[PDB]
Design a binder for this molecule. Structure first.
Ligand SMILES: [Ca+2]
Ligand SMILES: [Ca+2]
Ligand SMILES: [Ca+2]
Ligand SMILES: [Ca+2]
Ligand SMILES: [Zn+2]
Length: 316
């Protein structure tokens, strides 16, 4: 919409008050003109027709409980945009400042959130398993990271390349959680998962087996469910990313940790320069070793820790 840039105020899913970039034209719209070609948040109105209506508000105040999922989707899209821009010099998901569009209130009791090829889509959850999915910055950054992958490596969403595609999104969603710096950790979705139970989540990167996911190649899932285990086998690569960053000894193999910033640099470079649509785990290992070599030199601690982390998860 054509109008003026304004600043609204509202409350997110977890009751935190935040400022949001809006656009004024008769109504105040959730359209942030300050980042790239805009961030636009829409109301799907409990239906599944997309995108729905650009979110309109009469007074630029977003404190109704109905407002909360839109507040967070809009705000966390902006945080994710800033993470890629300030940390990776990447402008939006296509690298050319493409508009970021998100719809909330998708369907009824929908316990999921996804990138549909053109935009973000968040369910409200059923109140039991999930609360509104845009309340988790790691969920928002996970799903936007699929857009990044689609425009770069284009890893096919099946078998090994699919598990890489999933792991990359868990990794960058976690790094965005740390960048924003509010109660960060190495689990996925804890802020929106099961309002009745402390300390759980959908997935753990530090300990994938906590929720049934393999933490070593010898334990890979080889069936056909979940597109050949894209959410299951991502645990192997998540654990390797965790070891590269934090360090540790895993099945007897010791890894010197190099920290989150270098992990991000290494995996961003592999993603955008070395991985291809059909890459398997062993090709991810080579890409990450080549990335660390370009960035830090062939004799570096960084390269040595990458090799150790992949050794620890059984990937040669
Ligand atoms: Ca209002
Ligand atoms: Ca957290
Ligand atoms: Ca988390
Ligand atoms: Ca919980
Ligand atoms: Zn995903």
């Amino acid at each position: 919409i054509t109008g003026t840039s304004t600043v609204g105020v509202g409350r997110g899913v977890l009751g935190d008050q935040k400022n949001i970039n809006t656009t004024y034209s008769t109504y105040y719209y959730l359209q942030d003109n300050t980042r790239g070609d805009g961030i636009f948040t829409y109301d799907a109105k409990y239906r599944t027709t997309l995108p729905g209506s650009l979110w309109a508000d009469a007074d630029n105040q977003f404190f109704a409980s109905y407002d909360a999922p839109a507040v967070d989707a809009h705000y966390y899209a902006g945080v994710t945009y800033d993470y890629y821009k300030n940390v990776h010099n990447r402008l939006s998901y296509d690298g050319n400042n493409a508009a970021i569009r998100s719809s909330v209130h998708y369907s009824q009791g929908y316990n999921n959130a996804f990138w549909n090829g053109s935009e973000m889509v968040y369910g409200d959850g059923d109140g039991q398993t999930f609360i509104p999915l845009s309340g988790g910055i790691d969920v928002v950054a996970h799903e936007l990271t699929h857009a990044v992958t689609d425009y770069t490596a284009g890893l096919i969403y099946q078998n090994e390349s699919g598990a890489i595609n999933e792991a990359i999104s868990d990794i960058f969603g976690t790094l965005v959680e740390f960048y924003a710096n509010k109660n960060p950790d190495w689990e996925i979705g804890e802020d929106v998962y099961t309002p009745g139970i402390s300390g759980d989540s959908l997935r753990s990167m530090s300990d994938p087996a906590k929720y049934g996911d393999p933490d070593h190649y010898s334990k890979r899932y080889t069936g056909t469910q979940d597109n050949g285990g894209v959410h299951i086998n991502s645990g192997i690569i998540n654990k390797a990313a965790y070891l590269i960053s934090q360090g540790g000894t895993h099945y007897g193999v010791s890894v010197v940790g190099i920290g989150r910033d270098k992990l991000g640099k290494i995996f961003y470079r592999a993603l955008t320069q070395y991985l291809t649509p059909t890459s398997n785990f062993s090709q991810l290992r080579a890409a990450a070793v080549q990335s660390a070599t370009d960035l830090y030199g062939s004799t570096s601690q960084e390269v040595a820790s990458v090799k150790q982390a992949f050794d620890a998860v059984g990937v040669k």
